[PDB]
């Protein structure tokens, strides 16, 4: 059978302290080897213990707590509590608790009637040490009015799944995954939180974020970040679907992360850029709908940039690398900058800036007047003796609108390809146009740019900026 807290003396009347009865039900379920602790409809008042790590209710291995539904079963911190409480429901610190979860209930932090930092649901083994909770589940759970963190799974947790859950009106973050491994957040809503809707931090890796919605938060709707500690970066973070809109900061912020992907999401109405990527080694930005961002100021809907933490906790400089930005609808300017490696960068209807950096890159501007910047002669070249092509190709250059920014390369204009000029040439097929420097460097490399189509007769000098003054007069972007 199931274990009913009201059979253990829980009143569920909104005043009596039901902590002991709920914990007795949990302990009885544990003694039998596992089970379900069921709470009928009602408001159950709970309190904490002697220490912060005691939380309020200590859930245990093989024990699931199952209420009557969000707003129907409410576990609410007692009025006047003035003690920091790390997890109204939590597992034990120093124990690798496993195969437990919470279903069909509301956790209420009673922040209006209590003092101190309170978190709703807390998991993990020990900060900074090895060992993990595993097989943790939260389904159809609402966490509200906690002072710091609504859902705060922590270090370490393996195979956590939070689904169909809501976190709202919490102090800092509705959902925060700290060192989650092989974990899934799906079909959740995080809104009206103090700082973040969703926060993936502290070396979390192999995380799926599917069809989540974040709005009304004081900062990012979703942030994937290393954190404030000198620790390993998160990696393998796959965001699919969902919406991140009307937040006080960027819709989606990804910084100091490896192999992150954001696909199929709707990102609009945010105060900062819709998508901001800072020092990410491996970033896929695919088939998103990004519009009407930067509502509190800013010039870009999408920002790709590095992160200089040389004066920070790590002392390192992190370059954004290995970017594939394709298929997005972006109703504004996109700053698509990358570095060494092959990058595929596609703009949208806005006035975009594209620079793939070193390596062989494929650039396309889409609609609007787009600037394609080439900042170094080593960033696009062909070696004829080796018959090796490392030539950036521009897919859809439009001479009447787009601009090639070569202002820092020391070329003076079009010509025969020697002595500071670039030769405008057509391939023998008529399908490709080339801007070629016919002078080889010491390594036998020729600086070249490939443009798909036949542009020998329409591409002119005013389409290329050869120095700083020409860039000043011809610039197509505010970036």
Residue stretches of the annotated binding site for Ca(2+): 66-67, 91-92, 95, 97, 104, 111, 114, 124, 133, 339, 341, 343, 348, 350, 352, 356-359, 361, 365-368, 370, 376, 379, 392, 402
Residue 93 CB, nearest approach to Ca ion (Å): 6
- Does 55 bind Ca ion (CB under 5 A)? Our answer is no
E strand or H helix at 79: none
Binders in 91-120 for Ca ion, by CB under 5 A: 91-92, 95, 97, 104
Q: Say how many C-beta atoms besides its own lie within 10 A of residue 150's C-beta.
A: 31
Q: How many residues bind Ca ion (CB under 5 A)?
A: 26
Applying CB under 5 A, the span of 151-159, 242-250, 367-375, 469-477 interacting with Ca ion comes to 367-375
Classify residue 234 by burial, with Cβ atoms within 10 Å: 0-12, 13-18, 19+. Answer: buried
End-to-end CA distance of the chain: 64
| 39 contacts 65 by C-beta, under 8 angstroms | yes
Residue 169: how many CA atoms within 13 Å on its side-chain side? Answer: 10
- Name beta bridge partners: 139: 103, 163
Query: Binding Ca ion by CB under 5 A: which of 194, 274, 279, 368?
Result: 368
* CA dist., res. 50 & res. 159, Å (int): 30
Q: Closest distance between Ca ion and the C-beta of residue 453, in Å?
A: 13
Closer residue to Ca ion, CB minimum distance, 239 or 455:
455
Q: Pick between residue 122 and residue 215 the one whose CB is nearest to Ca ion.
A: 122
CA distances from 103 to 14, 77, 122 (A): 20, 18, 15
**Binding Ca ion by CB under 5 A: which of 20, 441, 457, 478?**
441
**364 forms part of the interface with Ca ion (CB under 5 A):** no
Output 200 or 348, the one with its CB closest to Ca ion.
348
- Show the binding pattern over residues 264-303: x = contacts Ca ion (CB under 5 A), - = does not: ----------------------------------------
Q: How far apart are CA 200 and CA 222, in angstroms?
A: 8
Give the tokens for residue 304.
Answer: 């790709």
SS3 355: strand
DSSP state of 453: S
Pick one of 359, 372, 403, 470: the residue that binds Ca ion (CB under 5 A).
359
Among 379, 393, 405, 448, binds Ca ion (CB under 5 A): 379
Using CA atoms, how far residue 44 sits from 77, 343, 403, in Å, is 8, 55, 65
Residue 234 touches Ca ion, criterion: CB under 5 A:
no
Binding residues vs Ca ion (CB under 5 A): 66, 91-92, 95, 97, 104, 133, 338, 343, 347, 352, 356-357, 359, 361, 365-366, 368, 370, 378-380, 392, 402, 441, 445
């Amino acid at each position: 059978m199931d274990f009913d807290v009201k059979d253990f003396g829980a009143k569920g009347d909104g005043k009596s302290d039901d902590t002991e009865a709920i914990q007795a039900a949990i302990d009885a379920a544990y003694e039998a080897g596992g089970g379900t602790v069921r709470l009928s409809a009602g408001e159950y008042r709970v309190s904490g213990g002697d220490e912060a790590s005691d939380g309020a209710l200590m859930i245990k291995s093989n024990v699931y707590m199952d209420g009557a539904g969000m707003g129907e079963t409410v576990i609410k911190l007692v009025d006047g509590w003035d003690q920091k409480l790390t997890g109204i429901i939590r597992s034990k610190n120093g124990e690798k608790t496993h195969d437990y979860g919470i279903r069909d209930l509301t956790l209420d932090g009673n922040q209006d009637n209590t003092e101190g930092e309170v978190d709703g649901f807390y998991t993990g083994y020990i900060p900074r040490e090895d060992g993990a909770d595993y097989n943790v589940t939260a389904e159809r759970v609402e966490i509200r009015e906690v002072s710091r963190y609504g859902f705060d799974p922590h270090e370490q947790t393996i195979n956590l799944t939070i689904r169909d859950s809501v976190a709202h009106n919490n102090g800092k973050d509705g959902f925060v995954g700290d060192f989650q491994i092989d974990s899934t957040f799906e079909n959740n809503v995080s809104h009206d939180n103090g700082r973040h809707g969703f926060n993936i931090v502290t070396s979390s890796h192999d995380i799926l974020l599917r069809d989540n919605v974040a709005y009304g938060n004081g900062a990012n709707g979703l942030v994937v970040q290393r954190g404030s500690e000198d620790i390993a970066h998160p990696y393998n973070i796959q965001i699919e679907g969902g919406a991140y809109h009307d937040n006080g900061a960027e819709g989606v912020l990804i910084k100091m992360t490896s192999n992150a992907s954001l696909q199929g999401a709707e990102i609009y109405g945010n105060d900062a850029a819709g998508v901001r990527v800072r020092g990410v080694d491996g970033m896929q930005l695919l088939d998103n709908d990004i519009h009407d961002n930067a509502q509190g100021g800013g010039k870009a809907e999408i920002v790709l940039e590095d992160y200089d933490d040389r004066d920070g906790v790590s002392g390192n400089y992190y370059e954004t690398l290995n970017a594939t930005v394709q298929g997005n609808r972006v109703a504004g300017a996109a700053q698509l900058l990358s570095s060494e490696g092959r990058d595929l960068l596609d703009g949208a209807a806005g006035n975009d800036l594209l620079d793939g950096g070193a390596g062989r890159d494929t650039l396309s501007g889409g609609g609007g007047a787009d600037t394609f910047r080439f900042a170094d002669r080593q960033d696009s070249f062909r070696n004829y003796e080796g018959d090796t092509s490392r030539v950036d190709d521009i897919v859809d250059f439009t001479p009447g609108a787009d601009l090639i920014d070569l202002s820092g390369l020391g070329y003076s204009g079009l010509g025969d390809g020697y002595n500071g000029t670039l030769a405008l040439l057509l391939n023998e097929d008529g399908t490709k146009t080339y801007l070629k420097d016919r002078q080889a460097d010491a390594q036998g490399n020729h600086f070249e740019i490939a443009l798909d189509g036949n542009l020998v007769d329409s591409l002119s000098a005013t389409d290329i900026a050869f120095d700083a003054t020409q860039l000043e007069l011809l610039g197509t972007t505010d970036l």
